[PDB]
């Protein structure tokens, strides 16, 4: 998959510094376009970053801060768009990269040619050379009056001169292959971009970063939209009009807008709108419904929208950081929550600022009916009287449209829970899972983490948990009645996939049909007690169904 959602985490410290380099690699591996921000923060000096060699396009900004790596291999990145900016002013931010000595040594951005919107921020880098020898105006867009240069030139080492074979002195490295390709300040006439000085070498008006010819199907990047190799200005409409009567007829060439490309259908986790936009949230007077196949769709409604529940970051909870006792009553009977759910340390104990009562462990029973979360789940505190997360038994799917820190969709931190708690969690739509620094945490490696993910960019990061050798040597090892050794925790319950038969929520063996007081009928390996008040039998099947007609008498 070449479309990977980026991270949303500024200079803020990581959750688990040990499993951080394993978080960047499990997210930008085999990716070419980043639908978000590219943030490279808090990397050790000897970290290997070979997985960042294929990044080409970034929708958001580029953040490179607090790193001791000598080289960042982002040599094949052409265009950064800048839909959202760092401090609302910058599109490229290289800060605080310093301690043979460690720290960033060279920028190594050889193909950067177009920044549509934003600025560049380079401050406090002692080991960085060649940072002020680049004509940054060329890389900035023609329609960008926000292009402000803030470059710090405080260096702790002596730099080398650029390669003499380079025409001028604009180089990103000392080697001969580190020159800069001037594109905009060398054009002849009113050409926004040109591959050379000749007017015939001018690029098409839809070329973003450059061109390999005069045509409109060979731009290095598409300025507005990418129509399967055709740099267009708009995606083809989803409907055609009679233009006299103006009637609606479906267009077989209808494409949907998804970032900077035209797509036949919206991606798996996204939503398709009648206007022709791949959304994560339906617009006003629209509604999210499931089609016959099972895909997600934003569909209109004449009647007012049904009352839905909202979580953190959503309509009236856009600024709440954790679930307190003030908003705990809102999630009453909500079979679906539009938004996230966070439990910070300040949730189960009252806040001195206000008269906030602390979260009693019996108040968390309102979540015993929740079945779907469209955002992340973040539990960094949990009562010690509750051994697991058994309040989320009915939680089936966490879609992860909104990700905590921009990467994680299921995070547990310092809980001290017993095994896992999460019984029926069967799907993580997007974002990684991070279960770390829980001392009494067993049952981590025995979860079908591949049967819950939905894309190759999802993974499981875990560290500083209970050692596995101590977990097995206690009699807690996925009781064998669970099929294929996939268990959620100790007991006849917590089996991910049953092997023989079910009796309610617990994994059981051959039913009590022939030797039980309630006579049962096995429907897809499910013991179900039915009262045989027609004919007491002693080893024969009494009832075929729950109705009176199916009874023996």
């Amino acid at each position: 998959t070449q479309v990977c959602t980026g991270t949303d985490m500024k200079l803020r410290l990581p959750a688990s510094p040990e499993t951080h380099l394993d978080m960047l690699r499990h997210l930008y591996q085999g990716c070419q376009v980043v639908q978000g921000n590219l943030e490279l923060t808090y990397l050790p000096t000897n970290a290997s970053l070979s997985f960042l060699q294929d990044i080409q396009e970034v929708q958001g900004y580029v953040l490179i801060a607090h790193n001791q790596v000598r080289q960042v291999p982002l040599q094949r990145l052409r265009i950064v768009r800048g839909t959202q900016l760092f401090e609302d002013n910058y599109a490229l931010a290289v800060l605080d990269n310093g301690d043979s000595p460690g720290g960033l040594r060279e920028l190594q951005l050889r193909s950067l040619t177009e920044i549509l919107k934003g600025g560049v921020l380079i401050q406090r880098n002692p080991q960085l050379c060649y940072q002020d020898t680049i004509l940054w105006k060329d890389i900035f867009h023609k329609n960008n009056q926000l292009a402000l240069t803030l470059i710090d030139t405080n260096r702790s080492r002596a730099c080398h001169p650029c390669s003499p074979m380079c025409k001028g002195s604009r180089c990103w490295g000392e080697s001969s292959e580190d020159c800069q390709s001037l594109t905009r300040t060398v054009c002849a006439g009113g050409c926004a971009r040109c591959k050379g000085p000749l007017p015939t070498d001018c690029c098409h008006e839809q070329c973003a970063a450059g061109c390999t010819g005069p045509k409109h199907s060979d731009c290095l990047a598409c300025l507005h939209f990418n129509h399967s190799g055709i740099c267009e200005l708009h995606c083809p409409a989803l409907v055609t009009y009679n233009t006299d009567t103006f009637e609606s007829m479906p267009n077989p060439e209808g494409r949907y807008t998804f970032g900077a490309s035209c797509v036949t259908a919206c991606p798996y986790n996204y939503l398709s709108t009648d206007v022709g936009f791949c959304t994560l949230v339906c617009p006003l007077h629209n509604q999210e419904v499931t089609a016959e196949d099972g895909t997600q769709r934003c569909e209109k409604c004449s009647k007012p929208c049904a009352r839905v529940c909202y979580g953190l970051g959503m309509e009236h909870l856009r600024e709440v950081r954790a679930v307190t006792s003030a908003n705990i009553q809102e999630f009453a009977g909500c079979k679906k929550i539009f938004g996230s759910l966070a439990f910070l340390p300040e949730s189960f104990d009252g806040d001195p600022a206000s008269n906030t009562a602390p979260l009693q462990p019996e108040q968390l029973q309102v979540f015993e009916t929740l079945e779907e979360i469209t955002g992340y789940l973040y539990i960094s505190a949990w009562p010690d009287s509750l051994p697991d997360l058994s309040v989320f038994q009915n939680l089936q799917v966490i879609r992860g449209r909104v990700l905590h820190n921009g990467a994680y969709s299921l995070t547990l931190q310092g809980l001290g829970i017993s095994w896992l708690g999460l019984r029926s969690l069967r799907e993580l739509g997007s974002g990684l899972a991070l279960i770390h620094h829980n001392t009494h945490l067993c049952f981590v490696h025995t979860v079908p983490w591949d049967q819950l993910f939905r894309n190759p960019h999802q993974a499981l990061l875990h560290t500083a948990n209970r050692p596995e050798d101590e977990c097995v040597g206690e009699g807690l090892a996925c009781h064998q009645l669970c099929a294929r050794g996939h268990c959620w925790g100790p007991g006849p319950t917590q089996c991910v996939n049953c092997s023989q038969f079910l009796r309610g929520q617990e994994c059981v063996e051959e039913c009590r049909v022939l030797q039980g007081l309630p006579r049962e009928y096995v429907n897809a390996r499910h013991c179900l007690p039915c009262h045989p008040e027609c004919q007491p039998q002693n080893g024969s099947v009494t009832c075929f169904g729950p109705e009176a007609d199916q009874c023996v008498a």
Epitope: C235, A237, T257, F277, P283, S302, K303
Partner: antibody, heavy 119, light 108 residues
Framework: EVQLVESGGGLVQPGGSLRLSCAAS????????MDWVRQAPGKGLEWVAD????????IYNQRFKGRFTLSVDRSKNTLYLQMNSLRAEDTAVYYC????????????WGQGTLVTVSS | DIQMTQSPSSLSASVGDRVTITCKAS??????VAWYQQKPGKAPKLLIY???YRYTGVPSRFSGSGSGTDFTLTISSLQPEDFATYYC?????????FGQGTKVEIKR
């Protein structure tokens, strides 16, 4: 908060051309259908046209098709309305509303820039 | 084209009375009818959609009704803020045409 500001209003001779703009903010631009409405001085309201931000497919009125020309610039959340061959009936205030779902009713109108034509 | 006609074109009422405004179309626009409000000099604001549902952020002293060709906008209690012009509109079929306006003003 959603707020829309129009511009381009002024005074031109009959037959002259103008181009009204309507910048949007506070909401996702490429998610709603954008519109232009006009009201003659001391008269009622008259829907003018209809534009789509993603495809660009514009829906005009039969009395205005051929003279007016809509456009969309998603790079700066701006609408464009090119008026050509203005007659003496084109003196009014030009609102700039938006669709909720692509059924033609409005909730968040603009400010109502004024266009007047006279010799 | 559909002619969207209100009746009456002008009305006077005191604060606290009951105001009834009727709009009528020349074609079947059963539930494709909205309502608006324009004070002198400021831009219009949505009040009713689908002829029976209020918009978010609108007081409860508004109740549209009527289906087919007859429609009605009613205010249960008047306040010294809703003295303005009330328009009706149809979006059921192209073209989409507003009404001529109904002016509601204080009585003495």
């Amino acid at each position: 908060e959603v707020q829309l500001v129009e511009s381009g209003g002024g005074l031109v001779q009959p037959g002259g051309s103008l181009r009204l703009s309507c910048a949007a903010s506070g909401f996702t631009f490429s998610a709603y259908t954008m519109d232009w409405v006009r009201q003659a001085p001391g008269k009622g309201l008259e829907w003018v046209a209809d534009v789509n931000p993603n495809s660009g497919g514009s829906i005009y009125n039969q009395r205005f098709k051929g003279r007016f020309t809509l456009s969309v610039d998603r790079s700066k959340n701006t609408l464009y309305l090119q008026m050509n061959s203005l007659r003496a009936e084109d003196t009014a205030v030009y609102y700039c509303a938006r669709n909720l779902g692509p059924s033609f009713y409005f909730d968040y109108w603009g400010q109502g820039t004024l266009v007047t034509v006279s010799s | 084209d559909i002619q969207m006609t209100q009746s009456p074109s002008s009305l006077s009422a005191s604060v606290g009375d009951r105001v009834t405004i009727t709009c009528k179309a020349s074609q079947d626009v059963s539930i494709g009818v909205a309502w608006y409000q324009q004070k002198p000099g400021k831009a219009p604001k949505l009040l009713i959609y689908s002829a029976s549902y209020r918009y978010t952020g609108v007081p409860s002293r508004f109740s549209g009704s009527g289906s087919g060709t007859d429609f009605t906008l009613t205010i249960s209690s008047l306040q010294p803020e809703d003295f303005a012009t009330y328009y009706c509109q149809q979006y059921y079929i192209y073209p989409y045409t507003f009404g001529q306006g109904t002016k509601v003003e204080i009585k003495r």
